[PDB]
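Objective 1.3, modelling of assemblies. Example input:
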Amino acid sequence: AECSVDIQGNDQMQFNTNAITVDKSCKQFTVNLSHPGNLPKNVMGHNFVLSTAADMQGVVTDGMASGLDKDFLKPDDSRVIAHTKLIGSGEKDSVTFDVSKLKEEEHFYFFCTFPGHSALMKGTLTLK
Ligand SMILES: [Cu+2]
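Predicted structure (tokens):
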């Protein structure tokens, strides 16, 4: 169907949704992230990061360590299926990935890796 979704992260430390469905029809899928709240990236930055459920903890933990200059993400992290930039108020970023990379598993988690964020900024992404 539509092979894109528009996601927002804000000042409430929440994305607007906790569930994304990707139409199995799609060869590619695009996630357009924007920040409709008011703070900078160095403080209340969000990114969108996609992994298997099992990999999320490692991604979030290795992320924190990497620091704000690496967008709180380990560079070249092979667990990460798709990722955007870290963004603050009124910035945006997009990421496109192959639907084939979701063939093998069931429940994936999307999440923000800014330290602490993933307490609320965790959702499920599935292939339907
Ligand atoms: Cu965040």
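The CA atoms of residues 13 and 117 lie 6 Å apart.
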